[PDB]
Amino acid sequence: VRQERLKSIVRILERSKEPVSGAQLAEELSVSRQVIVQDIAYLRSLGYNIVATPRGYVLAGGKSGVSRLVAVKHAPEEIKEELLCVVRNGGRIVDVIVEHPVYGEIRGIIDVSSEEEVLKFVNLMEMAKTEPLLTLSGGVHLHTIEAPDEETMERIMRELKKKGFLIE
Amino acid sequence: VRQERLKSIVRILERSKEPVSGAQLAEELSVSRQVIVQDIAYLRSLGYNIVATPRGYVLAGGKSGVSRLVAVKHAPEEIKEELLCVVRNGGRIVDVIVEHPVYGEIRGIIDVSSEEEVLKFVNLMEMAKTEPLLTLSGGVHLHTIEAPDEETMERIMRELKKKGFLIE
Ligand SMILES: O=C(O)c1cccnc1
Ligand SMILES: O=C(O)c1cccnc1
Ligand code: PRO
Ligand code: PRO
Ligand SMILES: [Fe+2]
Ligand SMILES: [Fe+2]
Fold first, then answer.
1. Binding of Ni(2+): at which residues (chains A, B)?
2. Domain final residue, candidates A24, A44, A60
3. Is B29 left (phi over 0), alpha (psi -120 to 50) or beta?
4. Chain A interface with B: residues with Cβ < 8 Å
5. Inter-chain contact A133–B103, Cβ cutoff 8 Å?
């Protein structure tokens, strides 16, 4: 019984598009909100990331996995192929790092985890007077890639290599 | 008498090319090194930056003054004119900052305070597969300039403006 209420609290937080207050949980699950307040503390000690906000609780992500630095080279027009490559294999492109001979290591935030975000990003970059960091670096540069597991990373690296992006 | 020993200790530290040990000061000024050790503590409380090292004392800089952010635009080939401009008016070019439309604010260390350093820097930059940050930015970029006083900064800004580098 307690386990079914616990499961239902999570369930409500993954599909609800707005923060859901303790009071709403109590009415939905026919317990007092004081009971809800205990259940939320129990679930966090378990490993769920529920934060309270002025409008109610929200379930947050975290639980990160593996990240690797990958060495690649490609032209400005190959950014879309590369990004879509990583994300379609369940990676996230954290950033780009160029090793600048004068300035040393120059970093750009990317944080691209989905297709929509790849297209938002390529659009911005293809504008006027905006050039990718690899143009400082004669093409060669680094990316920080994140993925759930080491298998997914290899998976991603396989695809990057057979497309011909890896520095090997 | 104490004042003349104090003056002579400083004097020795500005011209000596190697760290000069307490023991060397004592022999040079005909006091015990224990007296030297007191004089060094007296001079620091006064505002001199003497650090002890395994080989002896060295007098260090500090005592910084004013710094400004300056907005400029120029091509890659105009880097030497600009840098020599700032340093010849007693400024130091701390860095370059480009406002990248995608990545936001991208910074490069310059720390160029003398002519020799301007030429070392322009040489590096004029090589192959090394491009200045302003190439991401369609030319416009920022510099952090340091100078002894606010007068010197204006002095420097005057020169930058009449050469046609300022964004105004
Ligand atoms: O800024 C770059 O050079 C860049 C951006 C996205 C993906 N690869 C490189
Ligand atoms: O990197 C640049 O764009 C740069 C370097 C030195 C001076 N001005 C600009
Ligand atoms: O039943 C449980 O305890 C866990 C936590 C909510 C989902 N499953
Ligand atoms: O005589 C003094 O006290 C200061 C400190 C050394 C140089 N002049
Ligand atoms: Fe890339
Ligand atoms: Fe400049």
1. 74, 82, 141, 143
2. A60
3. alpha
4. 100-104, 106, 108-109, 121, 124-125, 127-131, 133, 135-138
5. yes
